[PDB]
């Protein structure tokens, strides 16, 4: 029977590599391995288990022993205090191993060179449990402790050992013990060497699976709790972590399924039998990653509840792992994660519930799509698929699947198998093309954290871990750092940033572009030496330090009705004096710069070679991994300030974050004043961008060269072209002057101003609301793509009508028009374009008005509910004379039929004017366009009107923006229903 294990599959796919790997095995030579799943023994002698794949593809369990278990506390080295520490450690009978003395540099507070180092007693332990108990007790007593990772100790093990848990690892020496499909290695941290090179192509196995459930009640989501509600069907595929080609496929079902060559059909009689078959197939495949779409919310809970009902969960889990036998209660308590708090955005988070089998890190691809698209309001797999440019098969609606399973049709069961396997393939495709595993691996490499942390955790702890990892190195002086929040929990708001009132309106004369700071907050940290160990709090200490000739930067900001003061010792551009935070940012910036240059070289080489080259695959892999590495560097670059400003962070320093914000505001003030004193106007400025204008005196010569000429359309377009050219050149010179002035002010070049395009035709409609033609290097006013930064266009827009009208007003408002010619404002032009759209219907077609819905007894919106009642009554009254259920049956499995609001003879509810597309094409009734205008595209032009001065509400209104919105919309809707009688 062709149920092939790891060994056979990897030997068939990689025969030569398998032979080489074997030859390494019996020779005990160093070989290439990397981890995927990390599991720790939290009781007894601590042991770290890495489950991963060898370079050929063997499933490998690497077990590290003799890992030192320790943490540090700021205590003097005297033996009396050591004995006292042991005394109150043994008071609560907490056992330790030994004591060590080493001098480290505290991370909090500035210290002089002769007092730079501080004593640290080190306490060793045998178990993570004892170490955590001791850490908690010491923090209760108030001792300043460092290197005290309490939850995930493997991050520390990855930290001082310089051993990434998501990169290739070379095993110099090991106690090899083959056991079935698991090649067990017993190793010691001494002979673990991270593979610093690029490394060979990965051969880790990811398994994507999807389930189909049964429930005798029609029209309801099956309940795992209900006995009658069951799983009738499950499918699964295995792939390489990078390839979308399935290595093997297995289908396990209830009804007799037609045999297929594309997958192995396993026939089971009972749900217990199906679950056991799934467990056996998973165990013999032993994948490194078990993944599925929304599995942590629907599939895994359903499977676990079914196993509990059958009382087979312990056996299922033991077959999942086979690495350590665990009792059922232990499984439920530890390995079955329930309602895991997955952080999606700053404010949005979702729950997850999965059975974390050792040796297979679970992935919820829906969670990955959430993370990569935080603001995507459409969350279905179909929604993400075409959002990412992938197509799905005809997803059979639930009801016909239901009748298919009930009738036990073998062909229809095979069709369900095809659909479910296509679902798993789409899941794998989304996981692969989004490059989720490799760039998560890169993030783990940078942060010295496991892939599990890279998946089910935010980036704050990753930034923390990277900070300690950098800090604990020798040249820096072995900085001692703590990973626990300390001090009183202070909550409040920083002083408001320097907000420049945007010059609302549409610009046709002065080219405008934003002088944007290059990584404002990281540059400020670099320039001002904003590091916790460079911070001075005492005013007298700051004065004494200044008396020694040292440069200090003073920060002052009002936080919770009180002034916060602090001083940071400048690094004097001396790498020895460079702070910890500036050192980390400098290293990251240099790495990113080198990687970007190498990526440019690699991409130009790739474009210099044809696609069918034999080395094209390897070159593409190299390019992909370089891009993932630089993207991880970028995301760590951006989130550094946010973690620094995170009050819950162990490294959080309120003076530090306040000083960073105040320095940003002060530098914005300085640049704004500098450019104002130079005659350059300002259109809009916020935080890090200054959209400025050149003085009118600069354009006078070309302006009169246009004026004294005949003033043709060609003359005006030229005038604009040389205006853009002069703006670019002169404002590049201005940017150079600004950079020089900033360097003179700060004494360093880290804080740098930059610009990347210019927007001669530009209109500002509010805060973070602007658009215009982008001229990057050469003035091109015929460009169709338009630089837009914040507007309700990129927020989907759905209907072709909405995107069409938005882009039409966009293009018409940005037309180059001579000052002598008519120059309507934004209000007039939007009124004109809307009049054109509504009066001239012949420009719109049926497909322009397509709107997608679903039969929603769950979401049961009032419009959706009246659509329910509408359609039901309509088919019931159509039944008397005929043709009422042919294409008109119940949409109960969320049938969409792309509903269109048709013209019905005159409540104004949406469901009142439903139309069937078949009926709409058959009779060709007109569409209720006025509904679409005055209820769906008013929200579009909303952002273009509320900026108008008379639409600003009086100061007595607390909800200013909402009232301005509502009354501007009322104005425009009265306009469109009064100028357009019919």
From TrEMBL:
Covered range of the whole protein: 2 to 993 of 1206
Reaction catalysis annotation: DNA(n) + a 2'-deoxyribonucleoside 5'-triphosphate = DNA(n+1) + diphosphate
EC number(s) stated in the UniProt entry for this protein: 2.7.7.7
Stated name of the protein: DNA polymerase
Summary of the function given for this chain in its UniProt record: DNA-directed DNA polymerase involved in viral DNA replication.
Domain DNA-directed DNA polymerase family B exonuclease: 162-320
UniProt-recorded Gene Ontology molecular function terms: DNA binding; DNA-directed DNA polymerase activity; nucleotide binding
UniProt enzyme class: transferase
DNA-directed DNA polymerase family B multifunctional domain residues: 486-938
Alphabetic keyword roster: DNA replication, DNA-binding, DNA-directed DNA polymerase, Nucleotidyltransferase, Transferase, Viral DNA replication
Family: Belongs to the DNA polymerase type-B family.
One of the GO biological process terms: viral DNA genome replication
Upper classification of the organism: Viruses, Varidnaviria, Bamfordvirae, Nucleocytoviricota, Pokkesviricetes
């Amino acid at each position: 029977i062709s149920i092939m294990d790891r060994s056979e599959i990897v030997a068939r796919e990689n025969p030569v590599i398998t032979q080489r790997v074997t030859n390494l095995l019996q020779t005990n030579a160093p070989l290439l391995f990397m981890p995927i799943d990390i599991h720790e023994v939290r009781y007894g002698a601590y042991t770290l288990f890495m489950y991963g794949s060898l370079e050929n593809g063997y499933k490998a369990e690497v077990r590290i022993e003799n890992i030192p278990v320790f943490f540090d506390v700021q205590i003097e080295f005297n033996d009396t205090n050591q004995l006292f520490l042991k005394s109150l450690l043994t008071a609560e009978n907490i056992v330790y191993e030994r004591l060590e003395t080493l001098t480290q540099r505290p991370v909090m507070g500035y210290r002089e060179k002769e007092k730079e180092f501080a004593p640290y007693i080190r306490i060793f332990f045998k178990s993570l449990y004892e170490r955590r108990k001791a850490i908690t007790y010491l923090n209760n007593m108030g001792y300043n402790t460092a290197a005290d990772d309490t939850t995930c100790y493997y991050r520390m093990v990855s930290r001082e050992l310089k051993l990434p848990l998501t990169s290739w690892i070379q095993l110099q020496h090991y106690s090899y013990e083959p056991r079935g499909l698991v090649h067990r290695f017993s190793v010691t941290p001494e002979d673990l060497v991270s593979y610093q090179n690029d490394g060979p192509t990965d051969h880790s196995i990811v398994m994507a699976y999807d389930i189909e459930t049964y429930s005798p009640v029609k029209g309801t989501v099956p309940d795992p709790n209900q006995a009658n509600d069951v799983v009738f069907m499950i499918c699964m595929r295995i792939f390489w972590i990078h390839s979308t080609e399935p290595l093997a496929s297995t289908c396990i079902t209830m009804a007799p399924c037609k045999k297929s060559s594309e997958w192995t059909t396993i026939l089971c009689s009972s749900e217990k039998n199906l679950l056991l078959s799934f467990a056996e197939q998973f165990s013999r495949w032993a994948p490194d990653i078990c993944t599925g779409f929304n599995d942590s919310r629907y599939d895994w809970p359903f499977i676990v509840e079914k196993s509990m009902q059958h009382g087979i969960l312990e056996e299922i889990f033991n077959k999942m792992s086979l690495f350590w036998h665990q009792k059922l209660d232990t499984i439920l308590k530890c390995y079955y994660v329930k309602e895991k708090r997955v952080k999606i955005s700053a404010e949005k988070s979702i729950i997850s519930s999965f059975l974390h089998t050792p040796g297979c890190l679970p992935i919820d691809v829906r969670n990955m799509c959430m993370q990569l698209y935080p603001k995507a309001e459409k969350t279905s797999l179909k929604a993400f698929l075409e959002n990412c440019g992938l197509d799905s098969k005809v997803d059979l609606p639930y009801h016909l699947m239901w009748k298919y399973y009930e009738t036990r049709d073998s062909e229809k069961i095979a069709d369900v198998a095809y659909y479910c396997i296509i679902d798993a393939q789409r899941c794998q495709d989304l996981l692969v093309r989004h490059n989720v595993i490799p760039d998560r691996r890169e993030v783990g490499i940078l942060s010295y954290t496991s892939l599990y942390d890279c998946i089910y955790y935010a980036g704050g702890h990753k930034v923390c871990n990277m900070l300690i990892a950098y800090a604990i190195h020798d040249e820096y002086g072995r900085i001692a750092c703590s990973t626990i929040a300390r001090g009183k929990r202070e909550h409040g708001k920083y002083p408001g940033a320097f907000v420049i009132d945007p010059v609302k309106g549409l610009e046709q004369d002065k080219p405008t572009t934003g002088l944007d700071f290059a990584s404002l907050y990281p540059s400020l940290i670099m320039a001002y030496n904003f590091s916790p160990e460079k911070f001075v709090a005492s005013r007298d200490e700051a004065n004494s330090l200044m008396a020694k000739g040292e440069s200090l930067h003073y920060v002052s900001f009002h936080f919770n009705n009180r002034l916060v003061e602090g001083w940071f010792v400048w690094h004097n551009n001396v790498p020895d004096k460079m702070g910890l935070y500036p050192k980390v940012l400098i290293d990251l910036l240099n790495k990113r710069t080198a990687l970007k240059q190498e990526l440019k070289k690699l991409g130009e080489k790739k474009e210099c070679i044809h696609e069918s080259h034999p080395g094209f695959k390897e070159l593409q892999f190299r390019h992909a991994m370089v891009d993932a590495k630089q993207k991880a560097l970028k995301i760590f670059m951006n989130t550094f300030y946010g973690e620094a400003g995170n009050n819950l962070s162990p490294f959080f320093l309120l003076p530090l974050a306040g000083g960073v914000t105040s320095s940003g505001q002060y530098n914005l003030k300085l640049v704004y004043n500098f450019v104002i004193n130079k005659g350059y106007g300002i259109k809009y400025g916020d935080t890090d961008s200054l959209y400025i204008t050149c003085p009118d005196s600069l354009y006078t010569e070309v302006t009169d060269a246009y004026l004294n000429s005949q003033k043709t359309i060609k003359h005006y377009e030229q005038l604009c072209h040389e205006k853009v050219l002069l703006s670019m050149k002169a404002m590049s010179t201005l940017c150079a002057e600004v950079n020089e002035y900033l360097r003179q002010d700060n004494g360093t070049s880290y804080l740098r101003m930059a610009y990347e395009e210019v927007l001669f035709p530009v209109c500002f409609t509010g805060k973070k609301k602007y658009y215009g033609i982008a001229h990057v290097n050469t003035p091109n006013f015929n460009t169709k793509e338009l630089f837009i930064r914040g507007i309700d266009i990129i927020k989907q827009g759905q209907t072709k009508l909405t995107k069409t009208i938005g882009t039409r007003i966009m293009e018409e408002s940005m037309k180059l028009r001579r000052p002598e010619d008519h120059r309507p404002p934004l209000i007039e032009i939007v009124k004109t374009v809307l009049k054109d759209a509504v009066v001239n219907m012949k420009q719109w077609n049926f497909e322009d008005f397509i709107q997608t819905d679903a039969w929603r007894p769950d979401k049961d919106n009032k419009a959706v509910q009246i659509f329910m009642s509408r359609m039901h009554a309509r088919r019931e009254q159509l039944k008397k004379h005929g043709a009422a259920a042919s294409q008109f049956a119940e949409p109960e499995p969320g049938e969409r039929f792309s509903y269109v609001i048709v013209e019905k003879q005159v409540s104004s509810r949406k469901g009142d004017k439903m139309e069937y597309v078949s009926e709409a094409k058959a009779k060709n009734l007109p569409i209720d366009i006025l509904f679409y205008i005055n209820n769906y595209v008013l929200g579009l032009c909303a952002r273009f009107i509320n900026e108008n001065e008379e639409f600003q509400p009086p100061d007595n209104v607390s909800n200013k923006d909402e009232y301005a919105q509502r009354r501007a919309k009322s104005y425009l809707q009265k306009f469109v229903q009064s100028i357009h009688p019919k």
